[PDB]
Design a protein around this ligand. Structure first.
Ligand SMILES: *[C@@H]1O[C@H](CO)[C@@H](O)[C@H](O)[C@H]1NC(C)=O
Ligand SMILES: *[C@@H]1O[C@H](CO)[C@@H](O)[C@H](O)[C@H]1NC(C)=O
Ligand SMILES: *[C@@H]1O[C@H](CO)[C@@H](O)[C@H](O)[C@H]1NC(C)=O
Ligand SMILES: *[C@@H]1O[C@H](CO)[C@@H](O)[C@H](O)[C@H]1NC(C)=O
Ligand SMILES: *[C@@H]1O[C@H](CO)[C@@H](O)[C@H](O)[C@H]1NC(C)=O
Ligand SMILES: *[C@@H]1O[C@H](CO)[C@@H](O)[C@H](O)[C@H]1NC(C)=O
Ligand SMILES: *[C@@H]1O[C@H](CO)[C@@H](O)[C@H](O)[C@H]1NC(C)=O
Ligand SMILES: *[C@@H]1O[C@H](CO)[C@@H](O)[C@H](O)[C@H]1NC(C)=O
Ligand SMILES: *[C@@H]1O[C@H](CO)[C@@H](O)[C@H](O)[C@H]1NC(C)=O
Ligand SMILES: *[C@@H]1O[C@H](CO)[C@@H](O)[C@H](O)[C@H]1NC(C)=O
Ligand SMILES: *[C@@H]1O[C@H](CO)[C@@H](O)[C@H](O)[C@H]1NC(C)=O
Ligand SMILES: *[C@@H]1O[C@H](CO)[C@@H](O)[C@H](O)[C@H]1NC(C)=O
Ligand SMILES: *[C@@H]1O[C@H](CO)[C@@H](O)[C@H](O)[C@H]1NC(C)=O
Ligand SMILES: *[C@@H]1O[C@H](CO)[C@@H](O)[C@H](O)[C@H]1NC(C)=O
Ligand SMILES: *[C@@H]1O[C@H](CO)[C@@H](O)[C@H](O)[C@H]1NC(C)=O
Ligand SMILES: *[C@@H]1O[C@H](CO)[C@@H](O)[C@H](O)[C@H]1NC(C)=O
Lengths: 780, 785
């Protein structure tokens, strides 16, 4: 084959070349790579084709021959430094001098087509910059190579990572994803991409939630950190192997789908695209380069391989000792590689710069002294060179410019395909109508942080940097003491705060005020009851000699009426602002006159029971003592035992006026409360026994038709008492705590009204309307 | 000049004499830039080391050691000196496949002071394996020997600097820091390394920010001003008070000036090796109010006889203003000691020792054989000697472990400007010997830089955000505690039915409260039940002592005997109520008490019916009355009521269950009352409902004939007892509906005993009265009336 014999070609101006032709210490010997690489040979053949076409043309470099010295440089820089030193050696000599500056050198090559590897391009460019040798490198992408401070003579024909990262940031901003997580490979490519994207996101308002590095083949902690934050957009600016390892681990761990913004490294790599189960990890949106392709490169490669097979030419006529023993099948897979255009355009740019430098027309090129390599730089900056009908230009920083295509993956039968859904030519323009997202419906995966917090909320700093304020609502009873607080602070426990309030509001007192409608109804009922009691009292004190009052007591009846009126009056002391004395004296003051009246009714019941259901021998002595001074002694004894019990339970059982600070929603309480069922139960034990004895001795009796039934009234009065307080107790145990005193007043008023309407009112009816029934033979 | 000294074996050097602090065709030489003093200091150190090697007859005897020092700029000029060193005496460097035969002009090189230039030089020297012992280059990329075969170091890498920072943070208990880096590769790499290292030591980073690259002696753009204002605002609004800065000293003037302008104080600044020893930043002298300024730097080693030597004194190989610049900074350099000077000293001595071992000299004679650079590299890789009480030996990763030192800035010129407070030993990765540090607090308290306060004893830890060290303290709800041994992130309930108070970390067994014999209300009810049982026993004895009497034959003889025995049984099983509730006690209670009570009440009601309403019913349904008189109607009705109660009570058993229940009372769940029926309210309501349904008809029939003498005024006493029972049941229902607690059992038992006493007394006590004290009313002749 002798293919490697074509790596040199004599010419007036000869170009250099650093290609990855081969692949992989104590003594200082250069390592030797014997493994063959198809991409390097394809690129070398592409540059040879570019040079041969440029020689073929007559309007570019007329009458001048362009050569090339394609030197094999492996990925290691040690094996690549020797070709550079050979390049800078004086032509015809194997020794390179060490002069003070570049102007005294006589390099054997006009320019250099730099290495594909960027890590190698760093060293090669830093070495060539001292000699000001114009090197244009295909495939060198990271941004720092554009620094003119340390690379005054480094150009390139591929866009920097800065433009693609700017496109990605514009995409995230335009789609609204301003809360994204940025990841990069552990090599310098990922780190530089991460730094550039940090700068761009900080400038554009985009936030990085987590900035980790996926290690080259750990990922578990990086994915855990990504999943901890609620992030739905992840920028994976990593090489092929790191991205493949991350996606395989995500296959193993079943990570939730996310929108992966892809770098150009793994966007179009069949390794990641062919991963099993990869379709279950959301959309993948990347920016693929928009560059033309050599429509005639495969034909040239095939015809040159066939011509090299012929021994006649090859005899008519190392760097790549392994390049000779190859066949067409060993290089067929890489004919359609997009870096061939980059190499071709780099060679065309070198030739166009040389043509401009010599300042010649299409007819010919004037004779002059040989042009030094450092003279190309004045015409390499600002170089408009047409490559395949498309004009390209070198920026002031040696960066070529070209458009980008936003390509999103689509899945049909586990076949990922790239659809153009946007264009980036310095200003993003996306067609999001035709984008098919991965969610349940075709809706954009939302990933956004609050740039500012709504007024009345607590702000918590989120993100890697101090990025976004996670607005937090604090539940009622708490307020933001100061804007810089990280948590809402409670009030003084005696004051209420509404939901989402800047400051707290005081708690006022809400007791049973005299203006509430329930108290007004109770007051009207009290007025009616007191009026009825007064009317009955007047009727009983005027007709005092009539048989009615005399048979039904006498002065005792007026005393009981006065007692009921006093109970009605003492009802008035329940509501209002609960002064300690008032709340303390509520019960006994309402319980004493009731005790007296019930004792009078019990005396009448005892008299009736004695006359009814005991033998006359006992009756003649019991009836003559149950009425009069002994009756007065009995009622005074009942009143005095009531007083004794009342003072005993007032000194022992404490009636307290507490303020339940945490019962009502917005207001406080002033609650007058006593022992649970103990206080009023003990106070009413006496009245319960009195009413029970009266009812028991009265409710069965013989009522002769020629007489007056003096027991029905007492029976109905005790029935009203028992029924009204049996109904009262559940009302006390059920009604809201505010209306508890109102329920107590209502119970007392109903008890008094029932006793009156059962005992006194029927008597007054016949005392005032039909006075024909007040005969002593009918009553005594 | 002093840049050259002829000798048998040269020793190239690269020192940064000038720096850039304010067109490619014109190449800017280093002499046009501002003069640095550290470069000349290190150059004088290396010259002194070489002169001491020449003086010493014990080391390299008869072999003069030379050197060739070339001024290397920070970035600009780093290729020409390399080509000068590698070329022959004729400034011609041959190109060949192997360099084993090649003999370079210099035999070793002391590399540049900045990492980028070190990498650039090492990438060139890799072809010939020229030994290159760099100093003050702290990047971690130089640790691997795959791409730097001939690169060695005299300074611990950034790994040990980061480790010292982390150990200093751990000692003072800081777990909430702020990382500030620079846009260059050094700051970014150090920040990434620190973030990777610190995440495994339970210390979190509040936020990471990058300061714009900004050389001094130039005026600032508005965008960078806004950036710095934003950085300072973010720093001030954050709660972290430990700020580490990974940036060269040139770009930190504006940041600190802006910090001073914004009036922000109280940060424990931590400095990397770049600006922890720079004198200008200390000479600013307005940062003393910002807070303590710690830093990481190489331990100073006092070189004997070096200060007097320093004070005694081709292309890019000259400087003129160096002496005048060093004159001003002489006193601060003398006080602060020599830190990087010893690195160059040790590098030169390592080269000399390697050469001595390679020549195999026996302290007197030397073979003077030709020395290839790779042979020297092989030899220096295995040097191990002593130097000023420090051991100089190279690790397999090209590093010699020199002790680090945490230094605190002191604003007092009478002593060392940078006072040392701690020492770090890279060999054991341990930071020890920490002295007192003058803090910026009120009474010299260690600054607190924790993101979350320690949780109070017995409080759940709720994570707040992404950072692990940040959390919120929320009290565990009542009924649970925390097992800090197991897990402090969630409350763990205490089994075996025990409750716990708020913020209580020790559950206590619930005290089982229940009815007991030795109690006041229990003994009161027992006394009442015993009195009733004795009274009923006396009544039964009287009745059996007097049969064949109109009172006992007109009344149901066997009926009353059965009722009396049932009341006896109920009273005797009343004491079963009190005591530890088991299955047997509940079974006996529910199978005995309702049966006896309901059968007694049903007999009462049917007796009242047959003594009052039967006479009236005799008119409407005569054949029904013939049926009733033919059989024993009251007995049939009592049997029907008995089987109905069997059915309903068995249904209640199958519904509400039979196991004793525990009911957490509303007052102090410390206690737990035990009852027989878990649903007691509905069971008591059902029982009282059936009993009252029978009671209404019984009492109504009694009242319908309350005046008929019948069986010695039976109706009146039935009415008396039945109204008593009705009032008792109503009172029990009301108190049940308005109260729920411990007293439920005693109240229910008292109500049951009172009902039994009513049924006994108000239905049999009048009979005892008539039998005993009225011996004339029980004669048979009284039947007619
Ligand atoms: C150059 O032109 C010749 C004819 O003169 C042609 O055969 C050859 O293919 C051309 N070389 C190219 C296109 O590289
Ligand atoms: C290069 O160095 C030489 C030294 O003789 C000097 O004359 C010449 O001007 C320099 N050229 C530059 C700095 O461009
Ligand atoms: C993918 O991950 C699984 C689980 O960790 C592992 O077993 C497997 O080897 C990985 N595959 C590749 C190709 O790395
Ligand atoms: C990710 O985070 C979610 C939400 O907190 C959690 O449910 C899930 O277990 C985490 N891990 C994975 C692998 O999805
Ligand atoms: C050509 O391909 C064959 C088949 O894979 C392989 O054995 C041979 O080594 C290749 N030749 C090279 C790489 O020169
Ligand atoms: C262009 O340059 C050539 C080479 O010197 C010269 O012969 C010719 O006259 C010039 N002009 C044109 C129009 O070709
Ligand atoms: C080259 O750039 C310079 C910058 O001033 C300008 O004079 C010139 O017009 C540019 N040439 C172009 C854009 O073709
Ligand atoms: C970019 O393309 C858009 C249309 O997509 C066009 O309007 C705009 O002018 C272009 N910008 C540049 C700088 O070419
Ligand atoms: C020793 O070195 C010193 C400087 O350290 C120098 O002045 C002196 O000349 C040398 N020789 C002797 C013999 O002291
Ligand atoms: C810019 O530089 C000038 C000249 O050194 C200096 O006087 C001035 O303060 C700087 N700033 C502005 C805002 O002009
Ligand atoms: C303190 O802070 C204020 C507010 O920013 C600032 O104006 C002032 O210069 C600072 N310093 C002093 C000494 O007040
Ligand atoms: C030392 O600090 C002073 C006071 O701020 C300053 O003026 C001077 O430039 C600094 N440096 C010296 C004296 O070298
Ligand atoms: C140092 O400065 C003085 C004046 O202060 C001057 O006379 C002397 O020449 C300078 N020395 C130099 C530039 O080496
Ligand atoms: C260097 O020598 C000392 C003294 O004998 C010894 O302690 C030390 O271990 C040696 N170091 C190595 C790396 O052999
Ligand atoms: C510092 O010392 C004083 C005097 O003993 C003491 O009262 C004070 O509390 C201390 N300062 C603080 C902030 O605790
Ligand atoms: C708490 O943890 C300890 C230690 O693991 C264990 O023995 C114990 O059972 C746990 N529970 C309690 C209630 O102490």
């Amino acid at each position: 084959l002798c293919l490697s014999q074509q790596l040199r070609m004599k010419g007036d101006y000869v170009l250099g070349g650093l290609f990855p032709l081969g692949e992989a210490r104590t003594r200082p010997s250069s390592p030797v790579c014997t493994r063959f690489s198809s991409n390097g040979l394809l690129w070398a053949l592409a540059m040879k084709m570019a040079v041969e076409e440029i020689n073929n043309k007559s309007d570019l470099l007329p009458g001048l021959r362009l050569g090339y010295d394609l030197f094999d440089t492996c990925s290691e820089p040690v094996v690549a430094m020797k070709p550079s030193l050979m390049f800078l050696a004086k032509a015809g000599s194997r020794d390179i001098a060490a002069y003070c500056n570049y102007t005294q050198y006589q390099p054997r090559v006009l320019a250099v087509i730099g290495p594909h590897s960027s890590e190698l391009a760093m060293v090669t460019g830093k070495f060539f910059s001292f000699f000001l040798m114009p090197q244009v490198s295909y495939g060198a992408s990271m941004e720092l190579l554009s620094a003119r401070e340390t690379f005054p003579s480094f150009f390139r024909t591929v866009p920097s990572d800065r433009v693609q990262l700017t496109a990605a940031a514009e995409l995230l901003q335009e789609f609204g994803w301003n809360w994204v997580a940025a990841l990069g490979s552990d090599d310098e490519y990922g780190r530089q991409g991460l730094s550039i994207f940090s700068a761009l996101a900080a400038a554009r308002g985009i936030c990085i939630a987590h900035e980790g590095l996926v290690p080259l083949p750990k990922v578990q902690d990086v994915l855990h950190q990504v999943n901890q934050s609620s992030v739905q957009v992840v920028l994976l600016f990593a090489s092929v192997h790191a991205a493949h390892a991350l996606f395989n681990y995500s296959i193993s761990s079943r990570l939730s789908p996310k929108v992966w913004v892809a770098s150009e490294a793994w966007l179009t790599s069949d390794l990641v695209m062919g991963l099993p189960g990869m379709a279950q990890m959301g959309t993948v949106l990347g920016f693929l380069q928009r560059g033309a392709q050599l429509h005639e490169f495969p034909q040239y490669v095939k015809t040159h391989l066939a011509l090299a097979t012929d021994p006649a030419f090859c005899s008519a006529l190392q760097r790549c000792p392994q390049c000779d023993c190859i066949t067409l099948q060993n290089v067929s897979a890489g004919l359609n590689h997009h870096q061939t255009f980059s190499v071709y355009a780099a060679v065309y740019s070198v030739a166009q710069a040389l043509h401009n430098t010599l300042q010649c027309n299409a007819s010919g090129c004037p004779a002059q002294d040989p042009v030094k390599p450092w003279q190309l730089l004045e015409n390499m900056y600002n170089l408009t060179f047409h490559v395949g009908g498309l004009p390209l230009r070198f920026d002031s920083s040696g960066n070529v410019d070209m458009e980008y295509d936003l390509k999103l993956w689509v899945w049909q039968g586990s076949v990922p395909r790239l659809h153009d859904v946007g264009r980036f030519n310095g200003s993003l323009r996306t067609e999001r109508l035709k984008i098919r997202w991965h969610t349940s419906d075709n809706q954009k995966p939302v990933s956004r942080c609050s740039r500012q917090c709504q007024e009345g909320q607590v702000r918590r700093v989120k993100g890697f940097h101090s990025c976004c304020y996670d607005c937090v609502d604090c539940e009622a009873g708490s307020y933001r003491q100061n804007p810089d607080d990280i948590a809402c602070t409670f009030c003084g426990q005696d004051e209420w705060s509404p939901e989402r309030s800047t400051r707290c509001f005081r708690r006022r007192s809400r007791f049973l005020a005299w203006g509430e409608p329930a108290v007004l109804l109770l007051l009207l009922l009290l007025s009616l009851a007191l009026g009825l009691v007064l009317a009955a009292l007047g009727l009983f004190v005027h007709h005092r000699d009539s048989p009615l009052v005399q048979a039904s007591g006498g002065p005792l009846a007026c005393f009981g009426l006065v007692c009921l009126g006093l109970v009605c009056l003492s009802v008035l002391l329940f509501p209002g602002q609960p002064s300690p004395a008032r709340c303390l004296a509520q019960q006994p003051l309402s319980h004493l006159p009731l005790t007296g009246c019930l004792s009078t009714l019990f005396l009448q019941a005892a008299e009736i029971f004695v006359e009814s259901e005991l033998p006359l021998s006992w009756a003649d002595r019991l009836s003559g003592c149950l009425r009069g001074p002994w009756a007065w002694l009995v009622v005074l004894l009942a009143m005095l035992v009531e007083v004794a019990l009342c003072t005993w339970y007032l000194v022992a059982f404490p009636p307290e006026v507490v303020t339940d600070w945490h019962m009502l929603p917005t207001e406080a309480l002033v609650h007058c409360r006593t022992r649970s069922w103990v206080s009023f139960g003990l106070a009413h034990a006496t009245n319960a026994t009195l009413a029970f004895l009266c009812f028991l001795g009265t409710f069965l009796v013989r009522s002769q038709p020629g007489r007056y039934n003096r027991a029905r009234g007492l029976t109905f009065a005790m029935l009203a008492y028992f029924i009204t307080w049996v109904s009262f107790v559940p009302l006390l145990a059920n009604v809201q705590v505010v209306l508890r005193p109102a329920v107590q007043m209502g119970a007392l008023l109903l008890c008094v009204l029932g006793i009156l309407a059962a005992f006194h009112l029927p008597r007054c009816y016949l005392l005032m309307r039909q006075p024909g029934l007040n005969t002593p033979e009918f009553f005594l | 000049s002093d840049f050259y000294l002829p000798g048998d074996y040269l020793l190239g050097g690269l020192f940064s004499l000038h720096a850039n602090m304010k067109n490619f065709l014109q190449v800017p030489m280093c002499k046009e830039y501002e003069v640095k003093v550290i470069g000349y200091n290190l150059m004088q150190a290396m010259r002194f080391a070489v002169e001491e090697i020449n003086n010493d007859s014990s080391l390299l005897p008869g072999v003069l050691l030379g050197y060739e020092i070339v001024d290397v700029c920070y970035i600009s000029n780093n290729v020409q000196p390399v080509l000068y060193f590698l070329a022959h005496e004729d400034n011609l460097l041959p190109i060949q496949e192997d360099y084993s035969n090649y003999i370079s002009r210099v035999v070793a090189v002391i590399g540049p002071d900045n990492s980028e230039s070190v990498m650039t030089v090492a990438n060139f020297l890799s072809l010939f394996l020229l030994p290159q012992i760099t100093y003050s280059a702290i990047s971690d990329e130089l640790r691997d020997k795959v791409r730097f075969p001939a690169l060695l170091r005299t300074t611990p890498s950034a790994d040990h600097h980061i480790e010292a920072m982390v150990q200093l943070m751990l000692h003072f208990r800081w777990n909430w820091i702020i990382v500030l880096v620079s846009s260059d590769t050094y700051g970014r790499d150090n920040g990434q390394l620190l973030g990777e290292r610190v995440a495994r030591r339970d210390i979190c980073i509040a936020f990471q920010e990058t300061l714009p690259t900004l050389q001094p002696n130039q005026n600032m753009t508005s965008e960078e001003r806004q950036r710095l204002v934003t950085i300072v605002d973010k720093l001030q609004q954050s709660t972290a008070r430990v700020v580490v800065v990974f940036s060269p000293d040139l770009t930190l003037y504006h940041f600190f000036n802006e910090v001073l302008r914004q009036n922000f104080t109280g940060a424990v600044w931590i400095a990397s090796e770049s600006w922890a020893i720079d004198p200008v930043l200390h000479n600013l002298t307005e940062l003393r109010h910002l807070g303590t300024f710690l830093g990481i730097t190489i331990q100073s080693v006092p070189i004997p006889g070096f200060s007097e030597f320093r004070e005694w004194g081709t292309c890019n190989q000259e400087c003129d203003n160096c002496l005048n610049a060093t004159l001003s900074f002489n006193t601060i350099l003398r006080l602060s000691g020599e830190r990087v000077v010893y690195s160059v000293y040790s590098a030169v001595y390592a080269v000399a020792h390697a050469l001595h071992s390679l020549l195999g000299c026996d302290k007197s004679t030397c073979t003077k054989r030709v020395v290839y650079p790779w042979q020297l590299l092989e030899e220096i890789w295995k040097v191990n000697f002593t130097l000023l009480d420090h051991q100089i030996f190279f690790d397999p990763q090209g590093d010699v472990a020199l002790h680090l030192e945490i230094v605190q800035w002191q604003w007092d010129r009478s002593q060392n400007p940078f006072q040392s407070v701690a020492s770090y030993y890279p060999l054991q990765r341990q930071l020890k010997n920490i002295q007192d540090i003058s803090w910026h607090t009120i009474n010299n308290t260690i600054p607190m830089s924790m993101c979350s306060k320690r949780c109070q004893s017995g409080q759940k830890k709720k994570p707040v955000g992404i950072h692990v060290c940040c959390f919120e303290c929320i009290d565990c709800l009542p009924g649970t505690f925390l097992n800090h041994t197991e897990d402090e992130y969630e409350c763990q309930a205490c089994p075996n039915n025990e409750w716990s108070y708020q913020s209580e970390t020790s559950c206590f067994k619930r005290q089982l409260v229940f009815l007991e014999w030795h109690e006041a209300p229990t003994i009161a009810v027992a006394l009442l039940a015993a009195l009733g049982f004795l009274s009923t026993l006396a009544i039964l004895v009287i009745f059996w002592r007097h049969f064949q009497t109109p009172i006992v034959r007109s009344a149901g003889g066997p009926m009353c005997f059965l009722m009396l025995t049932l009341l006896l049984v109920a009273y005797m099983v009343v004491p079963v109520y009190v005591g530890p509730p088991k299955v047997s006690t509940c079974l006996c209670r529910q199978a005995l008490f309702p049966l006896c009570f309901t059968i007694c009440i049903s007999c009462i009601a049917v007796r009242s019916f047959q003594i009052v309403c039967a006479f009236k019913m005799a008119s409407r349904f005569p054949r029904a009355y013939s049926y009733w008189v033919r059989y024993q109607g009251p007995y049939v009705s009592m049997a029907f009521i008995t089987v109905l109660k069997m059915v309903i009570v068995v249904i209640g058993m199958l519904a509400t269950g039979l196991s004793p229940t525990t009911r957490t009372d509303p007052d102090d769940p410390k206690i737990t009352i035990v009852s027989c029926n878990p649903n007691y309210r509905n069971s008591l309501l059902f029982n009282t409902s059936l009993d009252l349904l029978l009671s209404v008809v019984g009492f109504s029939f009694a009242y319908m004939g309350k005046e008929l003498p019948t069986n010695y005024n039976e109706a009146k006493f039935i009415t008396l007892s039945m109204t008593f029972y009705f009032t008792s049941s109503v009172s029990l229902c009301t108190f049940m509906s308005a109260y729920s607690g411990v007293l439920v059992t005693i109240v229910d038992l008292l109500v049951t005993v009172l009902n039994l006493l009513a049924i006994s007394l108000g239905y049999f006590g009048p009979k005892c009265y008539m039998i005993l004290f009225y011996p004339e009313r029980n004669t048979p002749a009284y039947f007619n009336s």
